[PDB]
Ligand binder design. Structure first.
Ligand SMILES: [Mg+2]
Ligand SMILES: [Mg+2]
Ligand SMILES: [Mg+2]
Ligand SMILES: [Mg+2]
Ligand SMILES: [Mg+2]
Ligand SMILES: [Mg+2]
Ligand SMILES: [Mg+2]
Ligand SMILES: [Mg+2]
Ligand SMILES: [Mg+2]
Ligand SMILES: [Mg+2]
Ligand SMILES: [Mg+2]
Ligand SMILES: [Mg+2]
Ligand SMILES: [Mg+2]
Ligand SMILES: [Mg+2]
Ligand SMILES: [Mg+2]
Ligand SMILES: [Mg+2]
Ligand SMILES: [Mg+2]
Ligand SMILES: [Mg+2]
Ligand SMILES: [Mg+2]
Ligand SMILES: [Mg+2]
Ligand SMILES: [Mg+2]
Ligand SMILES: [Mg+2]
Ligand SMILES: [Mg+2]
Ligand SMILES: [Mg+2]
Ligand SMILES: [Mg+2]
Ligand SMILES: [Mg+2]
Ligand SMILES: [Mg+2]
Ligand SMILES: [Mg+2]
Ligand SMILES: [Mg+2]
Ligand SMILES: [Mg+2]
Ligand SMILES: [Mg+2]
Ligand SMILES: [Mg+2]
Ligand SMILES: [Mg+2]
Ligand SMILES: [Mg+2]
Ligand SMILES: [Mg+2]
Ligand SMILES: [Mg+2]
Ligand SMILES: [Mg+2]
Ligand SMILES: [Mg+2]
Ligand SMILES: [Mg+2]
Ligand SMILES: [Mg+2]
Ligand SMILES: [Mg+2]
Ligand SMILES: [Mg+2]
Ligand SMILES: [Mg+2]
Ligand SMILES: [Mg+2]
Ligand SMILES: [Mg+2]
Ligand SMILES: [Mg+2]
Ligand SMILES: [Mg+2]
Ligand SMILES: [Mg+2]
Ligand SMILES: [Mg+2]
Ligand SMILES: [Mg+2]
Ligand SMILES: [Mg+2]
Ligand SMILES: [Mg+2]
Ligand SMILES: [Mg+2]
Ligand SMILES: [Mg+2]
Ligand SMILES: [Mg+2]
Ligand SMILES: [Mg+2]
Ligand SMILES: [Mg+2]
Ligand SMILES: [Mg+2]
Ligand SMILES: [Mg+2]
Ligand SMILES: [Mg+2]
Ligand SMILES: [Mg+2]
Ligand SMILES: [Mg+2]
Ligand SMILES: [Mg+2]
Ligand SMILES: [Mg+2]
Ligand SMILES: [Mg+2]
Ligand SMILES: [Mg+2]
Ligand SMILES: [Mg+2]
Ligand SMILES: [Mg+2]
Ligand SMILES: [Mg+2]
Ligand SMILES: [Mg+2]
Ligand SMILES: [Mg+2]
Ligand SMILES: [Mg+2]
Ligand SMILES: [Mg+2]
Ligand SMILES: [Mg+2]
Ligand SMILES: [Mg+2]
Ligand SMILES: [Mg+2]
Ligand SMILES: [Mg+2]
Ligand SMILES: [Mg+2]
Ligand SMILES: [Mg+2]
Ligand SMILES: [Mg+2]
Ligand SMILES: [Mg+2]
Ligand SMILES: [Mg+2]
Ligand SMILES: [Mg+2]
Ligand SMILES: [Mg+2]
Ligand SMILES: [Mg+2]
Ligand SMILES: [Mg+2]
Ligand SMILES: [Mg+2]
Ligand SMILES: [Mg+2]
Ligand SMILES: [Mg+2]
Ligand SMILES: [Mg+2]
Ligand SMILES: [Mg+2]
Ligand SMILES: [Mg+2]
Ligand SMILES: [Mg+2]
Ligand SMILES: [Mg+2]
Ligand SMILES: [Mg+2]
Ligand SMILES: [Mg+2]
Ligand SMILES: [Mg+2]
Ligand SMILES: [Mg+2]
Ligand SMILES: [Mg+2]
Ligand SMILES: [Mg+2]
Ligand SMILES: [Mg+2]
Ligand SMILES: [Mg+2]
Ligand SMILES: [Mg+2]
Ligand SMILES: [Mg+2]
Ligand SMILES: [Mg+2]
Ligand SMILES: [Mg+2]
Ligand SMILES: [Mg+2]
Ligand SMILES: [Mg+2]
Ligand SMILES: [Mg+2]
Ligand SMILES: [Mg+2]
Ligand SMILES: [Mg+2]
Ligand SMILES: [Mg+2]
Ligand SMILES: [Mg+2]
Ligand SMILES: [Mg+2]
Ligand SMILES: [Mg+2]
Ligand SMILES: [Mg+2]
Ligand SMILES: [Mg+2]
Ligand SMILES: [Mg+2]
Ligand SMILES: [Mg+2]
Lengths: 102, 109, 115, 150, 55, 141
RNA sequence: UGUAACGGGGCUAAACCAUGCACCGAAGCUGCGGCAGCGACGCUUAUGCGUUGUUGGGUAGGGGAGCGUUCUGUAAGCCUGUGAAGGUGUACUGUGAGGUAUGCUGGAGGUAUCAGAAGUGCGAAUGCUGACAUAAGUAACGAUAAAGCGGGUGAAAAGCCC
RNA sequence: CCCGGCGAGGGGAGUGAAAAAGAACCUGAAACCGUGUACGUACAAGCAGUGGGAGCAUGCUUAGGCGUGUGACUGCGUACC
């Protein structure tokens, strides 16, 4: 059932049905997306290869949320040299629910 | 019922009284009153009088029955310390601290 | 205008002492000691975001090298075999497939065998 | 600060931080490093700038319609009760009643009223014309202020 | 002489683990009167092994 | 996705036998230390003891190349005033043949609780007979 | 002081020399987001950007833009016993100084916005004052002239009385 | 009233809006010292954290997943001025 695909400059081993958090897409809050960058599909045997992507495989998904992650503090501190820095960060994500491993 | 009784500003440090107060903990009042009769310490007399009070405290006011009574919570807290000077050799002065304790006893069932 | 500063300082100490919550001894209880630990925790936190990426790559590569040698191929020839077959699948997944679906994994090594 | 200039303890020898006086600001109960002195905070303004500012603010009241210009404005007898009642017909509350001929009758009648203030056309201010919600100017007062500001 | 730097709550505790004193848990009973006392010691009233010792 | 990590409870540890007769010490010890750690297994995790139980029988008969049967010394301090005790590879096998494989493996494993934990699994033996017949320890090479 | 002159185990190849494709390997480069500084840009317009290339380690130091505090004006206004400030938790939120809301405690003050003025922010100065630790229940209890027993009073007596 | 030495100190009752407002008396922080609950902790080496991470203990709604506390084991890691 599971299939592999590239999204936010990185790949995801995903199954049909489950939710997946991935990097922000330029998409509305409840539209839909079609990943034609499918690298692999598994069931009985394996529809692998295709050079970068398979052939006629498309991973269809639905956009769940458009939130920001945990606050990651960044503390750069040079000991002894009268210097320190403070910087928060919240990475944007897009949660997507898979609805078709063709 | 819980029925608290406590010696506040008891002239003895926590450390010493807490040594006795570990003997009695989750023990039957009748058994606990005996121990402190034959515990050879000043703090035994100090803690006993609080418990022996706490039991009557409990029997008169609230709960009654001496048989079913256990010392549930007994604890000592460091009270105020009164400062005193003690002169040492070669002119220097040393601040002695006369320490006090807040002995609390809780006799529940 | 005299500015008494008992309110603002306590809040600043209290903020940091909350970040040091969990540490052993005075490092949790005592601002002057905690503030160092909270900074060093930040220095290590900044560092280990870089090391997380290194360690996991090693961790996957070990799993792939383990799973490949079961099938008879060493990691070096496997990845070259995949790169010569122009397979874009990363270590993260190869290691995940290697653990979970070995019946699947076998075919990737058999594909690497061809090249 | 009251005290002696004598060193509480000698420079060296004693295992303590070198001290010179009881009065030093790093100590308790004496010092305050940069102690304030009774100082004059009043600052210069150029005649043309003060006139220009009055001309600027007094012109803006014509836009906002806070400047209620009138003919003769004067209470009958020295009484607040009449002044409070007569402003209800005029539909006012918080005002600066500017007048050329300053009546004692009108003045005495507007001390106890908080939101009313009665100032002479000569003694107009920048802050007051801005502060109050309307400004009632007498035809004589306009003529005086016109000549004053120029 | 003199500590180089202060010990902890833990160490201070670790040292005191043995300071805890034990109870008696071994009270006798006088044959005649039925009074509690220490073993081989006389009673409060003045008895020892069911016989009157001191008035 | 958070990657899989082996769970100490779920790990299914296997038993093996390795006849060390006529084997090269280091190249044996290396392959032993590889398995003991749990490297060969595809579910390898560095913080869990995934490796297998190994029985190394005929340890006394282990072979070494060059002049190391005489030349190779095993130094150890006694934790004393000036007690540095040495022993050659002949003299080591002469007294304690189990120590040779033990020491050769121990160094190759990691150092720490898990490192000591994954050594426990190794079961060296001088004689051909082993009393671990109950586990059905299959043959390994 | 201890092997102690490969980092160790260990090796006749896991050494050396020569070639050959592999792979690992950094915050280096590429990938996908997000932020900011400049310079150009169609020339927009009074600046958002179809953009657009580009940077963006940093001590002394120089130049920008901010947070917060007590106080004065807006304020005899606004929020407050249907619970202020302060104390103490929790959950959101901003790139940071921080900010918002609320549980308990508290029992009466607080203060938007935009301005103004500062005793305006502390971890260090063998800093100054108070509080509390540590060593530690450790040393010591002040002449080595010496106590012993009985009775008395007392809640209790080695020390008080006889 | 009750315990105690016709004590110190407490516990009830009673006043009061309130007595953890009871005179050591508004508020009651921190250091520091405790009592009880959850986990860890007696073959294990070092600025005591940090990334990874099993188990165990607790909450929520669902018939599956999270948060919080803990942190076995493990890569890196020599405080601040
Ligand atoms: Mg884009
Ligand atoms: Mg206990
Ligand atoms: Mg003395
Ligand atoms: Mg003396
Ligand atoms: Mg003298
Ligand atoms: Mg003030
Ligand atoms: Mg924790
Ligand atoms: Mg945490
Ligand atoms: Mg400390
Ligand atoms: Mg704390
Ligand atoms: Mg570093
Ligand atoms: Mg990298
Ligand atoms: Mg002089
Ligand atoms: Mg000096
Ligand atoms: Mg000193
Ligand atoms: Mg001063
Ligand atoms: Mg004074
Ligand atoms: Mg003064
Ligand atoms: Mg000036
Ligand atoms: Mg007004
Ligand atoms: Mg008046
Ligand atoms: Mg003119
Ligand atoms: Mg003129
Ligand atoms: Mg030191
Ligand atoms: Mg001891
Ligand atoms: Mg010798
Ligand atoms: Mg290591
Ligand atoms: Mg074990
Ligand atoms: Mg030597
Ligand atoms: Mg050597
Ligand atoms: Mg080497
Ligand atoms: Mg080589
Ligand atoms: Mg070469
Ligand atoms: Mg770069
Ligand atoms: Mg980018
Ligand atoms: Mg150009
Ligand atoms: Mg661009
Ligand atoms: Mg810079
Ligand atoms: Mg501003
Ligand atoms: Mg503000
Ligand atoms: Mg303010
Ligand atoms: Mg104000
Ligand atoms: Mg006013
Ligand atoms: Mg008023
Ligand atoms: Mg009012
Ligand atoms: Mg009114
Ligand atoms: Mg006023
Ligand atoms: Mg507010
Ligand atoms: Mg409320
Ligand atoms: Mg409230
Ligand atoms: Mg508040
Ligand atoms: Mg804000
Ligand atoms: Mg604000
Ligand atoms: Mg509100
Ligand atoms: Mg409120
Ligand atoms: Mg008032
Ligand atoms: Mg105020
Ligand atoms: Mg305020
Ligand atoms: Mg204001
Ligand atoms: Mg408001
Ligand atoms: Mg506001
Ligand atoms: Mg506004
Ligand atoms: Mg200051
Ligand atoms: Mg301070
Ligand atoms: Mg400093
Ligand atoms: Mg004071
Ligand atoms: Mg003692
Ligand atoms: Mg000692
Ligand atoms: Mg001792
Ligand atoms: Mg001693
Ligand atoms: Mg002594
Ligand atoms: Mg004496
Ligand atoms: Mg002496
Ligand atoms: Mg003498
Ligand atoms: Mg003599
Ligand atoms: Mg008598
Ligand atoms: Mg008498
Ligand atoms: Mg009597
Ligand atoms: Mg009497
Ligand atoms: Mg009597
Ligand atoms: Mg009696
Ligand atoms: Mg006597
Ligand atoms: Mg005597
Ligand atoms: Mg009585
Ligand atoms: Mg009595
Ligand atoms: Mg008496
Ligand atoms: Mg009292
Ligand atoms: Mg009394
Ligand atoms: Mg009461
Ligand atoms: Mg009654
Ligand atoms: Mg009642
Ligand atoms: Mg009442
Ligand atoms: Mg009432
Ligand atoms: Mg209350
Ligand atoms: Mg209330
Ligand atoms: Mg009460
Ligand atoms: Mg009450
Ligand atoms: Mg209460
Ligand atoms: Mg109460
Ligand atoms: Mg009050
Ligand atoms: Mg109070
Ligand atoms: Mg408190
Ligand atoms: Mg407190
Ligand atoms: Mg417990
Ligand atoms: Mg337990
Ligand atoms: Mg346990
Ligand atoms: Mg051992
Ligand atoms: Mg253990
Ligand atoms: Mg140790
Ligand atoms: Mg270490
Ligand atoms: Mg640690
Ligand atoms: Mg941590
Ligand atoms: Mg972590
Ligand atoms: Mg985890
Ligand atoms: Mg974690
Ligand atoms: Mg559980
Ligand atoms: Mg549940
Ligand atoms: Mg480690
Ligand atoms: Mg290290």
């Amino acid at each position: 059932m599971y299939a592999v695909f590239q999204s936010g400059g990185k790949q995801h081993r995903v199954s049909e049905g489950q939710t997946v958090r991935l990097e922000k897409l330029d998409i509305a809050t409840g539209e839909t997306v079609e990943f034609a960058e499918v690298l692999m599909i598994a069931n009985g045997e394996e529809v692998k290869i295709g050079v970068p992507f398979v052939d006629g495989g498309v991973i269809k998904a639905e956009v769940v949320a458009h939130g920001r992650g945990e606050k990651v503090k960044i503390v750069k501190f040079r000991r002894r040299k009268h210097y320190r820095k403070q910087q928060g960060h919240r990475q944007w994500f897009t949660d997507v629910k898979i609805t078709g491993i063709s | 019922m819980e029925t608290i009784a406590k010696h506040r500003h008891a002239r003895s440090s926590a450390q010493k009284v807490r040594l006795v107060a570990d003997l009695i903990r989750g023990k039957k009042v009748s058994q606990a009153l005996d121990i402190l009769t034959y515990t050879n310490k000043k703090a035994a007399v100090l803690v006993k009088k609080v418990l022996e009070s706490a039991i009557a405290n409990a029997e008169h006011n609230d709960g009654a029955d001496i048989d079913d009574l256990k010392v549930t919570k007994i604890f000592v807290d460091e009270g105020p310390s009164m400062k005193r000077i003690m002169p040492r050799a070669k002119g220097r002065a040393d601040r002695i601290l006369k320490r006090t304790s807040h002995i609390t006893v809780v006799v529940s069932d | 205008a005299r500015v008494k500063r008992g309110v603002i300082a306590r809040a600043r100490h209290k903020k940091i002492l909350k970040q040091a919550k969990g540490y052993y001894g005075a490092r949790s209880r005592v601002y002057r000691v905690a503030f160092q630990a909270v900074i060093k925790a930040g220095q290590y936190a900044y560092r280990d975001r870089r090391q997380r990426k290194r360690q996991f790559r090693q961790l996957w590569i070990a799993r792939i090298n383990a799973a490949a040698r079961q099938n008879g191929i060493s990691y070096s020839k496997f990845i070259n075999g995949l790169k010569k077959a122009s397979v874009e699948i990363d270590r993260k997944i190869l290691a995940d497939i290697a653990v979970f679906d070995k019946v699947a994994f076998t075919a990737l090594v058999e594909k690497a065998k061809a090249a | 600060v009251t005290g002696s200039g004598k060193k509480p303890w000698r420079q060296k020898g004693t295992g303590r931080a070198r001290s010179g006086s009881i009065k030093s600001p790093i100590w308790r109960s004496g010092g305050v490093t940069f102690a304030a002195r009774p100082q004059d905070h009043s600052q210069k303004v150029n005649k043309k700038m003060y006139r220009g500012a009055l001309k600027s603010i007094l012109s803006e009241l014509v836009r906002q319609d806070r400047l209620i210009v009138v003919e003769k404005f004067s209470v009958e007898a020295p009484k607040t009760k009449l002044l409070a009642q007569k402003l209800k017909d005029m539909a006012l509350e918080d005002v600066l009643i500017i007048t050329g001929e300053l009546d004692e009758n009108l003045f005495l009648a507007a001390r106890n009223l908080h939101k009313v203030d009665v100032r002479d056309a000569t003694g107009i201010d920048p802050v007051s014309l801005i502060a109050f919600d309307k400004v009632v100017m007498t035809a004589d007062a306009v003529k005086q202020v016109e000549e004053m500001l120029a | 002489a003199v500590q180089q730097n202060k010990p902890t709550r833990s160490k201070r505790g670790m040292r005191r683990s043995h300071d805890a004193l034990t109870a008696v848990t071994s009270l006798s009973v006088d044959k005649t009167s039925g009074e509690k006392h220490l073993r081989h010691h006389i009673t409060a009233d003045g008895y020892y092994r069911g016989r009157k010792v001191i008035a | 996705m958070k990657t899989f990590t082996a769970k100490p409870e779920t790990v299914k540890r296997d038993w093996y036998v390795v006849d060390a007769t006529g084997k090269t010490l280091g190249r044996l010890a290396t392959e032993l230390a590889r398995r003991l750690r749990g490297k060969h297994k595809a579910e390898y995790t560095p913080h869990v003891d995934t490796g297998d139980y190994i029985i190394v029988l005929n340890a006394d008969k282990v072979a070494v190349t060059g002049n190391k049967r005489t030349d190779k010394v095993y130094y150890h301090h006694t934790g004393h005033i000036g007690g540095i005790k040495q022993a050659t590879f002949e003299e080591m096998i002469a007294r304690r043949p189990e120590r040779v494989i033990e020491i050769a493996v121990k160094g190759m494993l990691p150092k720490g609780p898990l490192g000591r934990a994954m050594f426990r699994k190794l079961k060296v033996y001088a004689g051909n007979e082993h009393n671990h017949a109950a586990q059905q320890p299959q043959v390994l090479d």
